[PDB]
């Protein structure tokens, strides 16, 4: 099969870290949990 | 038909379309280089013999092109599906070498709105295109990542604050 | 076949003339850096022509060998001649041909044979700046 | 008679071996040059080239003629392509 | 150049500067002769 299944893994690997860091960017800096 | 393939290729649209045409012109040279280095003049039958098993691989590309015609994503997806269509013939490496460079500009493009925060779209080849700052529009490619990049880039535009 | 060899020749003489006309005392800052950085590629073209020179001295060459020889060099001369045409055409000098050198490097993203070429002349030109 | 036999044998139709799809290659059978002894041998040699033409035409017909846009199972197939690929190397 | 750097080098009407300029111009010619000496000998052609 000719599809990306070994190049897309280091791409989703970055997408996930980005989204985790933004959800963390809310809580431990802007205190959405205190709201 | 070799002549009408060079007659088909001309360039100074789309970036991936330009890359596809330059990859085709990189094969026409090989076809011109192989003649006069194996077969100058031999038996009369040998020439028709040598360029039947070689000429048919060239003649598939006339069926492939318009020898209107797809551009943009409509090219980049259709040629993608020509990979899964043909993988088990003599026309597998030429289609493979064409797709490997018709996706060469797009892979760089995706690598921009994720890392540095630069959104690239100037030809209509980029998939995501069109208060709480998130009003962006969205209306083959693996759909597993299509909505993923849409949410991952709108996130990066918020971390840039 | 002789007509097919000519595009490296018309994209050599043009490439030479940009180094000859714009060796003058005044012009913009990037173009003076760019002349001294384009002449380096003229020298590296010569080392292949120097091998060819020795071979032609030894009573031997043919047109099919020559045609096979000049296929790699044609693209590099094409990129240099296009750069010279664009820099002379737009009347750009100073920092406005530090924009053109920046845009042309982004433009090539399908082969990166010419992208690196524009990069090398820009990395040489941004060192005095 | 010398190159004519080979061009008929090569799978390109002759000018003495008149190509029919219902009687293959066939010698003219009425010229002053031919006599029965060579005639029957020529006709025997005709049949192998008759077969070769249908073989190569079949191979060209069912291989590499589609972009895959459906489709018919005896007019196409992965097995038909594999068949033709084997046949030419045989 | 060579006429001027011959004449001014021993001229004291022109002052100390200019004998110094001549020294600079002589030093530029020193690097120019070494090339030409190679170029004569490697003639056999030389394009």
From Swiss-Prot, chain B:
Transmembrane domains' residue ranges: none
Localisation: Cytoplasm, Cytoskeleton, Microtubule organizing center, Centrosome
Source species, domain of life: Eukaryota
Cystine residue pairs: none
Known partners and oligomeric status: Component of the gamma-tubulin ring complex (gTuRC) consisting of TUBGCP2, TUBGCP3, TUBGCP4, TUBGCP5 and TUBGCP6 and gamma-tubulin TUBG1 or TUBG2. TUBGCP2, TUBGCP3, TUBGCP4, TUBGCP5 and TUBGCP6 assemble in a 5:5:2:1:1 stoichiometry; each is associated with a gamma-tubulin, thereby arranging 14 gamma-tubulins in a helical manner. Gamma-tubulin at the first position is blocked by TUBGCP3 at the last position, allowing 13 protafilaments to grow into a microtubule.
Stated role: Component of the gamma-tubulin ring complex (gTuRC) which mediates microtubule nucleation. The gTuRC regulates the minus-end nucleation of alpha-beta tubulin heterodimers that grow into microtubule protafilaments, a critical step in centrosome duplication and spindle formation.
Associated pathology: Microcephaly and chorioretinopathy, autosomal recessive, 1: A syndrome characterized by microcephaly, cognitive impairment, underdeveloped retina and choroid, and epilepsy in some patients. The more anterior parts of the retina, near the periphery and pars plana, have a grayish hue and diminutive vasculature similar to retinopathy of prematurity. Visual impairment becomes evident during the first year of life.
Swiss-Prot record, chain C:
Tissue expr: Ubiquitously expressed.
Effect of residue 75 to C: In CDCBM15; uncertain significance
Domain of life: Eukaryota
Phenotype upon changing residue 39 to C: In CDCBM15; uncertain significance
Subcellular location: Cytoplasm, Cytoskeleton, Microtubule organizing center, Centrosome
UniProt function note: Component of the gamma-tubulin ring complex (gTuRC) which mediates microtubule nucleation. The gTuRC regulates the minus-end nucleation of alpha-beta tubulin heterodimers that grow into microtubule protafilaments, a critical step in centrosome duplication and spindle formation. Plays a role in neuronal migration.
Family: Belongs to the TUBGCP family.
Binding partners and assembly: Component of the gamma-tubulin ring complex (gTuRC) consisting of TUBGCP2, TUBGCP3, TUBGCP4, TUBGCP5 and TUBGCP6 and gamma-tubulin TUBG1 or TUBG2. TUBGCP2, TUBGCP3, TUBGCP4, TUBGCP5 and TUBGCP6 assemble in a 5:5:2:1:1 stoichiometry; each is associated with a gamma-tubulin, thereby arranging 14 gamma-tubulins in a helical manner. Gamma-tubulin at the first position is blocked by TUBGCP3 at the last position, allowing 13 protafilaments to grow into a microtubule.
Name of the protein this chain belongs to: Gamma-tubulin complex component 2
Gene: TUBGCP2
Section covered of the full-length record: 259 to 387 of 902
From Swiss-Prot, chain D:
Top-level taxon of origin: Eukaryota
Tissues in which the UniProt entry reports expression: Ubiquitously expressed.
Subcellular compartments: Cytoplasm, Cytoskeleton, Microtubule organizing center, Centrosome
TM stretches of this protein: none
Record family assignment: Belongs to the TUBGCP family.
Chain's role: Component of the gamma-tubulin ring complex (gTuRC) which mediates microtubule nucleation. The gTuRC regulates the minus-end nucleation of alpha-beta tubulin heterodimers that grow into microtubule protafilaments, a critical step in centrosome duplication and spindle formation.
Complexes and interactors: Component of the gamma-tubulin ring complex (gTuRC) consisting of TUBGCP2, TUBGCP3, TUBGCP4, TUBGCP5 and TUBGCP6 and gamma-tubulin TUBG1 or TUBG2. TUBGCP2, TUBGCP3, TUBGCP4, TUBGCP5 and TUBGCP6 assemble in a 5:5:2:1:1 stoichiometry; each is associated with a gamma-tubulin, thereby arranging 14 gamma-tubulins in a helical manner. Gamma-tubulin at the first position is blocked by TUBGCP3 at the last position, allowing 13 protafilaments to grow into a microtubule.
Protein name: Gamma-tubulin complex component 4
Species annotation: Homo sapiens
Complete-protein stretch covered: 1 to 96 of 667
UniProtKB/Swiss-Prot annotation, chain E:
Tissue: Ubiquitously expressed.
Domain of life according to the entry: Eukaryota
Localization per Swiss-Prot or TrEMBL: Cytoplasm, Cytoskeleton, Microtubule organizing center, Centrosome
Described purpose of this protein according to its UniProt entry: Component of the gamma-tubulin ring complex (gTuRC) which mediates microtubule nucleation. The gTuRC regulates the minus-end nucleation of alpha-beta tubulin heterodimers that grow into microtubule protafilaments, a critical step in centrosome duplication and spindle formation.
Assembly, per entry: Component of the gamma-tubulin ring complex (gTuRC) consisting of TUBGCP2, TUBGCP3, TUBGCP4, TUBGCP5 and TUBGCP6 and gamma-tubulin TUBG1 or TUBG2. TUBGCP2, TUBGCP3, TUBGCP4, TUBGCP5 and TUBGCP6 assemble in a 5:5:2:1:1 stoichiometry; each is associated with a gamma-tubulin, thereby arranging 14 gamma-tubulins in a helical manner. Gamma-tubulin at the first position is blocked by TUBGCP3 at the last position, allowing 13 protafilaments to grow into a microtubule.
Family the UniProt entry places it in: Belongs to the TUBGCP family.
Protein name (record): Gamma-tubulin complex component 3
Natural source organism: Homo sapiens (Human)
